[PDB]
């Protein structure tokens, strides 16, 4: 297909339930909220997660994404020990500290900056500290470059031959796995030496995890999970953080309301008092602007599933071994579900999204395959906007007619969103 070229390629020639051939598999795209409910609500019952083989070889077969059945449930339980709302509140300080440092170091004293490069650095560095407690900038830059190489092979042709992108990506995964295996060895030692806590980061959470039978996670499962996690954490959270101020510039009224919400929160805090989980909950309108950005520019257009049994959706029957694709482009860009879909209206998510119809806004999927790091991303997006507004009274886009594009899946500012900075 050509996502980087066009999106929303529908076929009035067929019903919302239209069959097609995708990645050499008969795939029926179930367009519409009901098709979304069918695919996302019936997991391990009528359908099962199916990733293309190319991705299976890049992130491994021992991740929560590549595992199905009880194992996937166990792997999600271990991850809930870090991404669960209760635990996630224990990492706000480190995340807030990094975002504040990044803004003060690379943004505060700059007349003009390119957002994309800075957002990618902050997003990855936050993962390096929360996943492996790695603060060494050079080590962070090393692993950042290694992930960039492996990410190039995910969209390239799956040719495992010398001098090919997919081949070099597989070489990067082997290197990253060796580095991560070393981190696992050192962490186990630090834990026995009392040099590391069991909740300081995701590595300790995964190592410290035991099944109801008391069986621990294997090193390969920890490596594959960390790889699948690094893939779902970088180019995803980067899309909204780089596009939020681009859309807020085209809708200054919305930016005004965000600044009003942020400065009000600060007016109720002492000097030196750090942002709190309660402060984050007070950023309701800021979160509505983020959801409006995700609706208009979904970092993930949709995912595929495998028919684990014959399916009788509507009148047509989806036989076992068939593929099923759902798309945010069946509801997000539809006036039927979102009035004036081309218009940026954070008001669409007023009252905590109490007016959003079911299976219409699915930026983080739904069911048992829903995003594991959605609130982790929301925390970063809110803390990022907070520190920006706290530091800058205003900002001016260098090219207000800058376009949005993807190479090929992550929608991002076509030129990095260069902006003039006006420090408070
Ligand atoms: C640190 C950041 C993130 C992490 C660690 C993360 C991790 C994950 C994990 C573990 C899953 C479940 C995979 C499975 O078991 O099948 C998932 C699903 C998903 N994530 Fe993320 N994610 C992150 C950020 C994002 C962002 C920013 C978006 C969108 C803007 C996103 C969109 C999704 C979607 C749509 C799904 C479900 C896809 C489907 O099954 O239909 N994620 N993510
Ligand atoms: C959501 C999800 C969580 C981690 C596992 C997945 C399968 C890795 C492959 C991918 C990413 C690099 C980021 C996002 C989706 C899916 C990923 C696509 C296919 C682009």
> Cα of 377 to ligand 1 centre, how many Å?
10
> Cα of 102 to ligand 1 centre, how many Å?
25
What the block records as the tokens of 107 is 């943004």
Rounded to 5 degrees, φ, ψ at 366 are -170, 165
The answer to whether the beta carbons of residues 227 and 58 sit under 8 Å apart is yes
Residue in this structure with the two tokens 């060494």, named with its chain if needed: 136
Nearest protein CA to atom 4 of ligand 1, as residue: 373
Residue in this structure with the two tokens 């962070």, named with its chain if needed: 140
Q: Is the CB of 49 under 6 A from ligand 2?
A: no
Q: Is the CB of 303 under 6 A from ligand 1?
A: yes
Report the atom number in ligand 1 closest to the C-alpha of 127.
1
Residue in this structure with the two tokens 């209206």, named with its chain if needed: 345
Binding site for heme, by residue number, is 371
The answer to whether the beta carbons of residues 416 and 239 sit under 8 Å apart is no
> Cα of 91 to ligand 2 centre, how many Å?
23
- Name, in order, each residue with C-beta under 8 angstroms of 217's C-beta and a sequence gap of 6 or more: 75, 78, 206, 207, 209, 225
The answer to whether the beta carbons of residues 422 and 122 sit under 8 Å apart is no
Q: Is the CB of 230 under 6 A from ligand 2?
A: no
Distances (CA, A) of 215 to 94, 163, 209, 211, 212: 31, 41, 8, 5, 7
Distances (CA, A) of 164 to 41, 156, 169: 39, 9, 9
CA distance 84 to 63: 18
- Residue-range domains of the chain with CATH: 21-423 (1.10.630.10)
Distances (CA, A) of 413 to 243, 319, 399, 408: 7, 41, 11, 13
> Cα of 407 to ligand 2 centre, how many Å?
15
What the block records as the tokens of 310 is 């014959």
Q: Is the CB of 150 under 6 A from ligand 1?
A: no
Residue 412: exposure state from Cβ atoms within 10 A (0-12, 13-18, ≥19): buried
CA distance 229 to 59: 9
Q: For residue 237, which of 381, 130, 106 has the smallest C-alpha distance?
A: 381
Element (H, E) at 422: strand 418-423
CA distance 33 to 361: 9
Residue in this structure with the two tokens 């995890």, named with its chain if needed: 209
CA distance 228 to 356: 30
Q: Is the CB of 228 under 6 A from ligand 2?
A: yes
Ordered alpha helix ranges (H), 2-52? 33-41
> Cα of 56 to ligand 1 centre, how many Å?
16
Crossing angle for the helix pair 284-296 and 374-391, to the nearest 10 degrees: 110
* Mutate-to-test residue for ligand 2 from 300, 328, 365, highest number of ligand atoms within 8 A of CB: 300
CA distance 67 to 312: 26
CA distance 84 to 260: 30
Q: Is the CB of 237 under 6 A from ligand 2?
A: no
Q: Is the C-alpha dihedral spanning 35, 40, 45, 51 positive or negative?
A: positive
CA distance 263 to 248: 17
Which DSSP letter does residue 3 get? T
CA distance 385 to 387: 6
The answer to whether the beta carbons of residues 140 and 133 sit under 8 Å apart is no
Question: What angle is formed at CA 41 by the lines to CA 36 and CA 47, rounded to 5 degrees?
Answer: 90
Residue 366: how many other CB atoms lie within 10 Å: 17
CA distance 15 to 19: 10
- Name, in order, each residue with C-beta under 8 angstroms of 2's C-beta and a sequence gap of 6 or more: none
The answer to whether the beta carbons of residues 389 and 81 sit under 8 Å apart is no
CA distance 305 to 308: 9
Residue 19: strand pairing partners:
28
Helix (H, G, I), strand (E, B) or coil at 208: helix
CA distance 77 to 83: 10
> Cα of 112 to ligand 2 centre, how many Å?
33
Report the atom number in ligand 2 closest to the C-alpha of 299.
14
CA distance 231 to 316: 36
Question: What angle is formed at CA 155 by the lines to CA 151 and CA 157, rounded to 5 degrees?
Answer: 120
* Beta-sheet strand order (sheet of 418-423): 112-114, 418-423, 392-397
Distances (CA, A) of 310 to 19, 48, 307, 318, 323: 15, 12, 7, 6, 11
* Mutate-to-test residue for ligand 2 from 61, 228, 238, 325, highest number of ligand atoms within 8 A of CB: 228
Nearest protein CA to atom 11 of ligand 1, as residue: 371
What the block records as the tokens of 69 is 């059945």
What the block records as the tokens of 3 is 């996502």
The answer to whether the beta carbons of residues 29 and 18 sit under 8 Å apart is yes
What the block records as the tokens of 96 is 């807030």
CA distance 142 to 119: 17
Helix (H, G, I), strand (E, B) or coil at 423: strand
Q: Is the CB of 231 under 6 A from ligand 1?
A: no
Rounded to 5 degrees, φ, ψ at 175 are -65, -45
The answer to whether the beta carbons of residues 241 and 384 sit under 8 Å apart is yes
The answer to whether the beta carbons of residues 147 and 235 sit under 8 Å apart is no
CA distance 339 to 424: 37
Q: Is the CB of 187 under 6 A from ligand 1?
A: no
The answer to whether the beta carbons of residues 384 and 106 sit under 8 Å apart is no
CA distance 316 to 168: 43
Q: Is the CB of 294 under 6 A from ligand 1?
A: yes
CA distance 371 to 242: 20
User: DSSP letters along 297-334, please?
Assistant: S-SS---EEEESS-B-SSSS-B-TT-EEE--GGGTTT-
> Cα of 225 to ligand 1 centre, how many Å?
12
- Name, in order, each residue with C-beta under 8 angstroms of 224's C-beta and a sequence gap of 6 or more: 59, 60, 61, 62, 63, 66
* 3-state SS string for 87-135: HHCCCHHHHHHHHHHHHHHHHHCCCEEEHHHHHHHHHHHHHHHHHHCCC
User: DSSP letters along 364-376, please?
Assistant: T--GGGS-SSHHH
**Cis-peptide, bond into residue 408, ω within 30° of zero:** yes
Count the residues in the chain. 424
Q: Is the CB of 237 under 6 A from ligand 1?
A: yes
Q: Is the C-alpha dihedral spanning 350, 355, 361, 363 positive or negative?
A: positive
């Amino acid at each position: 297909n050509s996502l980087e070229q066009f999106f929303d390629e529908r076929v009035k020639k067929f019903g919302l339930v239209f069959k097609t051939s995708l990645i050499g598999h008969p795939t029926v795209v179930l367009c519409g909220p009901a098709g979304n409910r069918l695919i996302l609500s019936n997991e391990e019952k009528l359908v099962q997660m199916s990733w293309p083989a190319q991705f299976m070889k890049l992130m491994g077969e021992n991740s929560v994404a590549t595992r199905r059945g009880e194992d996937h449930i166990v792997m999600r339980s271990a991850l809930a020990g870090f991404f669960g709302p209760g635990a996630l509140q224990s990492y706000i300080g480190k995340m807030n500290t990094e975002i504040q440092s990044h803004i003060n170091e690379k943004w505060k004293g700059k007349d003009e900056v390119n957002v994309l490069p800075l957002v990618r650095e902050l997003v990855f560095n936050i993962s390096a500290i929360l996943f492996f407690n790695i603060y060494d900038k050079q080590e962070q830059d090393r692993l950042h470059k290694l992930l960039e190489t492996i990410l190039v092979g995910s969209f390239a042709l799956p040719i495992d031959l010398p001098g090919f992108g997919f081949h070099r990506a597989l070489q990067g995964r082997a290197k990253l796995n060796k580095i991560m295996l070393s981190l696992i060895k050192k962490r186990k030692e630090d834990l026995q030496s009392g040099s590391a806590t069991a909740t300081q980061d995701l590595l300790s959470v995964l190592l410290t995890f035991r099944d109801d039978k008391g069986t621990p996670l294997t090193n390969d499962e920890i490596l594959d999970n960390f790889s699948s996690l690094l893939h779902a954490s970088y180019d995803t959270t980067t899309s909204p953080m780089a596009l939020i101020f681009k859309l807020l510039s085209s809708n200054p009224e919305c930016y005004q309301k965000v600044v009003q919400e942020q400065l009000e929160i600060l007016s109720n805090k002492e000097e030196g008092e750090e942002i709190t989980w309660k402060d984050l909950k007070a950023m309701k309108y800021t979160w509505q602007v983020a959801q409006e950005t995700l609706r208009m520019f979904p970092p993930v257009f949709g995912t595929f599933r495998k028919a684990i049994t014959d399916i009788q959706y509507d009148g047509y029957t989806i036989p076992k071994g068939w593929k099923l694709l759902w798309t945010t482009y069946s509801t997000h860009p539809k006036d039927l579900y979102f009035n004036e879909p081309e218009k940026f209206m954070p008001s669409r998510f007023d009252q905590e999204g109490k007016h959003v119809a079911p299976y219409t806004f699915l930026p983080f999927g739904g069911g048992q395959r829903s995003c594991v790091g959605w609130e982790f991303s929301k925390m970063e997006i809110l803390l990022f906007v907070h520190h920006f507004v706290k530091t800058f009274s205003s900002y001016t886009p260098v090219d207000p007619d800058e376009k949005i594009s993807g190479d090929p899946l992550p929608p991002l500012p076509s030129k990095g969103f260069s902006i003039k900075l006006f420090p408070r």
